[PDB]
């Protein structure tokens, strides 16, 4: 069959074409022990990948091969790929077509080396590398709209009008869920709870995923929370309980004002969409405003679509009624679109055969894959 | 075969690998006469080791070569080793592998000189020196847990998570059964029975081993015993009978509050475990609380595990349910774990060959033995 | 005396009439701090203009008052003017005549408000606003020719035949050095070097000004550079070194094919000149082809005049031999022409006196200034 | 006048504004007796603060109110403050302005309660709480640079460029002189000298302050010291002499590799500075490399600045020449900077008046004090 | 007033508070006739106490109620107390406060029954029982030091540092002047003079008090005395003269080596002090070495302080200079300290009132008296 592997910065989503949801979602981490093994043969493993690293994180040093959508450690990335194939999918990579995803405006060498590893190390017969926002637009079952995809390493905006790309209106900000997690971990020190190790960063990520929400009116929420002192209790793995105060709505606020983490000139979620739309031709802006698609796990915060729609409406002219489409399953929207695309009968001629790679070498994906 | 010799401060336990219990347990004492021999040839021995010294203790001055887990008299220690081999095991040390144990954070010169004596004086072919808490965890048949080992000279706490050492969470207090015996001998003077000689210290040790018990509630027990005047009779070797009052539960109480013997800042049995657990990573604390292993003869007091479990539960957060594992045979738990480890087929490459010692000299055990 | 101030989009050039070169050239930027001042009195300034903003750009947010030749921020523009007078020229504006320049076919309100600010805020006695291409033709010392001026915000083409204007043959494209800088900053992401802040945009501008060159044959250069992988090293301010590959000749290529930045229907440098010439009367085309004048800093790329002359010759009929005049000092050609014009004895009756402004109000410059 | 009180984790430094050095430096310890007073009226004191506790440490249990820059015992802290005012400065706190210091990214409640105690318990008229690194940069008489301050409880790095804060580039590691003292006390057990009581911890601290030095090449020093067995003699208070071997250069080595004390993922002295610089804007990094300021007593080890400068140069690009500024009086650099700041005529409007506290309550220092 | 009664094993010292010396010192003996009274009314007394028993010792059987500081005969002890009050002090015990002394670590029932007898049999209004070494330290007018008190039944060592007790460093050996007298009486049999009756034991005690001296070098003295045969003549009451040879310096030698009387493991005078000092904290040892206080009549031998100081200096480290304080009136040092303590105005609230005894019964002195 065909393999749809959505290698994200934080989570790896793998499966087969035609399915409605990925069958294997595990973190994109590689852990190694930081202490000598006192016993004999109990923990003989030297490298842990995926859920195994997450399970033993208390005695491991976790590492992310992908940073901001760019693979910074290729040995760990190929370890993750070997895991994803053999231990996760339990299929021979040589017998299946592999579909990969990548953020727009990534370095060319990243895609080139990814293709080289897929064709040589795993002997994949045919390969194709797509764009995450295009697949996210595919999954919604529409051919026109602007996709705001925010995952774990990068958020990008890609407008598409009736199937035609608008390459000069594509935005990209290296600010996503990992930056939010780091900011939350920093601002939790005010309450008196400091997390420093990589293992303790996962606890902060869980706090972010469970308690954080987007405030409808940040300034009003900030003042009312100051006096009422409303806070929620989060139970740490050791059994201790810590209280999370205004950090619940301050952590996702950095999406709407990235100056809180040093990105002073970064636009923010509504401003980036507005600028991307205004970079397009005047005749297509009205249909782009009326169809805004959210994707990625960093768009899953409570009240985020409503806040985004309210903020965009202020920027847009009074005759425009923006509509934000936030599917409940938008976390896996990229994988669903990739599965849909790979199941199309027209797409079967778009695969990059290994024979073509043997002829023209790398950078073949830079000409036919878009 | 292989020899598993657990040289403790008070008791020497020797045997062969594969056995379920040591075949020779005798005190680690060396006695010498303090009076001239009036008769001719009846008692021509000048040095007594082991049970012989204990049998003739009335006319001998007993000495312990090991103090607080550290050999303070090497001539007496090598006398004890010569006894343990020839008179006890009746085997040639040159034909067997010797496994030795040592408390954590001991001086390096102690282990170096022990290795030198084993390799040169006894010509042992291969040697290995382990850690008592690790072997105690081996004997329980588990790879995760925190071991509280309290013998005769020192009590130490060693956390181990899934076979990985946690060296920065290891505690060590030089307070064990010998200090309890001395405290009992001091507080028996209140009743009107003073023991001063080393021979009379063994009587106090027997009193401690037979009558002393840990009170579930020390303050309630102290008041009720004051009015009821409940006491038990202990028969001295000479035939006299002395009464032991509140000293039955006061003597082991110093384990839970070492300030009674001048160790004002020492933690105590539950506090030391709590601190050792809290020195570990937050992700491993929950599994360490749920598996606490007791070892050594000083943990054999009545109601000691129940009192320890109750005390630790107060310190631990309300979401934690500590479980204390106290095997009935925990006195020999270190030797059992050493026998199990030496019988493993993987361990056979971990012996320190005598050829290696001839090459790199001493301190070879500091690099490969842990 | 008289003041010749050439307020460009990127650079401000000021001086006095009769001089052969501007005495003060500084960027047209206004910077404001983005962080709170921790110390006391060291950096008490709140707004930085000119070279001061460029010097402290690492802690400032730089802004350009002029976009595409149109003043989009009048407060910052009047700050720049106040700087240019007092801190740069150190003369009283009330005592001198001011000569200003403006791109053709600009909005009328822009010139009206510029005149209002000059007459009211600075109390300038007499004012005149010219056209940059006319002054560029003045500086060459000729009365016939077609001027292709490309600065930082806009490129315009103005044909003049024997001193007579040809208003219906004037072209204007909002594509100049700033668009080239943005395109270079976008295409440097392929190598793996992303610049996002306004301060880092100046580094990209310096890269463009130092390394970029116009390829004689773009298609041949593109293929040969692909295989030879020829690239140059540029040292960033922090000390790091980044390699610039094919972006050296791709960045200025957008002048000859503006479709690379979304201006699909824009003509380009040779096509715009050809269309502007063909919009003129048939009797004047031959003399316009034989005298093409380049102006502005965006025409300073290596091999740009040769490439332009080759490209125009293909469009022109075979009986025409176009000649492109590219003076070495064409960056300041507008200012030189303004200085020459203001020093003419005939021009002294063309100033707009402040009394005339008090009578007819604004839009007086729309009738007598051309 | 004004009071400059630098409440550190280990040492309290107090004085008046305008002086070049603190007039009263005493340890921040509170001691209580652990034994009953046998005599009558000789030692009627029940709590000892400062040098008195240090003098009688042999019969006292010493406690540090401040841990890692955070006050963990407010009663002892206010005892220390009462001592510092009345017994040390011998002035009425109600008649003077008090300047306090605090580590960056401390819990907000710590500063709030400190302000509450100063305003209510001592009735201080006006108060101000600064940042230790900012004052350390003040004392050097420069407005640009990066300050590496390492005291007794925490080490922090604060970059400042031309007086503007860089809040997102501030690092903080809870590893300072007290952790070094604990590590030295642990590793002295290898030689055969165990210190356990709090009184004996001061002896280890004196050993660290007198004998420990930073090795220029740790690996080369470790091997050469192993064979030469070079060691120095330290005389204990009782008159005994103990030998300190490789622990002289191993104890301060944990600053450059904090994994020796369980901080496996902590950066270390050069790595923390490098990361803090690289968190800043590219335009300011070159000036931050060329001006590195050391502060605190934990930076006073021999050859520490040279080792740090060598280590940073390897991390920095080859075009960068880092310069480390280590004033001889850098132990009191924070107090000197505080005295300089409080003597400035501009600073006199920055005090938090008690009337303001009565109006807005606490957290007033969170808005105007930085 | 107040009564200071120092009930020793051999001598009873009584007096009133404020005096510089006891006004009544008599032996603590009770004698009874061993023969029938032949005459009529000449010697009608049946029990003799004090000097009367000593005067008629030739026809009486003398008995000591106190053995090793413990009252073994309460009827004789209360006879001695009745004598000491009525026949010696000639005051009503009901009208005075009584201060009593007791050796440390005595049985609790001894003190309880002493208090019961004082409160019930003699109807003493208020009572207090102190420690002999504490009072001996009081008499020297110092609050720090280590007291070596050796009387007639027991020698004990009590360190005190700045008024704070060090209970875990207190030593006690049941070997004092009576054991020396018995040893002298045994070793006088070698010369040919056997004393067996209790009356003849007093002659041996007088010989010990008049002729015995401590040898500076025992081994050198033993050899030189063997050849020179130097001996002194002692006149018995009957008029006979016996010669005392090497027994002059052998009798007090048992203090420095108690193995001569079967106390093989007893430390001896310098060893006991050294061990008691080393049981203390390291910070207080230096001041304890420099202040050693001698007390009791068994320390009155010639050259004893010099020999003790020489012996201790060998044990102490080379950096220590021990100083032994031996007041000329150290025999009554305990009584002087008791008189000083009872005259303090602060001590007046420390008396145990008879009403308190009626409420809480006995063992009240175990809580408030120390
Ligand atoms: N329910 C949630 N609410 C808020 N944030 C979430 C939620 N689930 C995941 N996230 C954030 O989204 C990130 C994962 O996004 P994902 O789409 O998996 O990224 P990628 O596409 O790189 O795999 C995590 O870092 C997490 O912080
Ligand atoms: N049944 C018992 N109850 C209480 N204490 C005991 C008991 N048996 C032994 N002990 C104490 O434990 C000590 C022996 O412990 P052990 O484990 O033999 O030490 P080591 O490991 O050094 O040989 C003795 O000093 C004794 O006081
Ligand atoms: N030597 C050069 N080579 C290439 N481009 C240059 C050079 N010098 C300046 N430029 C470009 O020209 C622009 C400045 O042109 P200028 O004539 O100063 O514009 P204006 O007329 O608006 O002041 C800059 O944005 C820069 O990108
Ligand atoms: N000369 C020295 N050499 C090495 N370390 C020192 C020296 N003096 C002090 N220290 C260490 O520095 C610490 C005191 O630093 P200090 O700046 O007083 O901290 P704080 O700012 O918290 O008062 C002590 O714990 C000590 O270990
Ligand atoms: N001048 C002396 N020289 C040597 N020993 C003496 C001297 N005087 C008394 N003694 C010894 O000291 C003992 C008396 O000591 P004392 O302090 O009275 O004891 P207590 O404190 O029990 O009353 C006697 O047994 C005697 O042997
Ligand atoms: Mg994704
Ligand atoms: Mg043991
Ligand atoms: Mg211009
Ligand atoms: Mg400090
Ligand atoms: Mg006495």
Residue numbers in the entry:
A (entry chain D), B (entry chain C), C (entry chain E), D (entry chain A), E (entry chain B): 6 to 375
The authors write:
To uncover the molecular basis of rapid LmActin filament depolymerization, we determined the structures of ADP- and ADP-Pi-states of LmActin by cryogenic electron microscopy (cryo-EM) in the absence of any actin-stabilizing agents at average resolutions of 2.7 and 3.3 Å, respectively. Moreover, the subunit conformation in the ADP-Pi state is nearly identical to the reported ADP-Pi state of muscle actin (RMSD 0.454 Å). By “forcing” actin filaments into the ADP-Pi state with a high phosphate concentration in the buffer, we measured barbed end depolymerization rates of ~6 subunits/s and ~1 subunits/s for LmActin and RbActin, respectively. From these experiments, we estimated that the rate of Pi-release from actin filaments is ~5–10-fold more rapid in LmActin compared to RbActin under the same experimental conditions. Thus, similar to RbActin, the release of phosphate triggers the faster departure of actin monomers from the filament barbed ends, but the lifetime of the ADP-Pi state in LmActin filaments is greatly reduced compared to mammalian actin. However, the residues around the proposed “backdoor” pathway for phosphate dissociation are conserved between the two actins. Thus, it is possible that both the dynamics of the nucleotide-binding pocket and subunit dynamics within the actin filament may contribute to the faster Pi-release from LmActin compared to vertebrate actins.
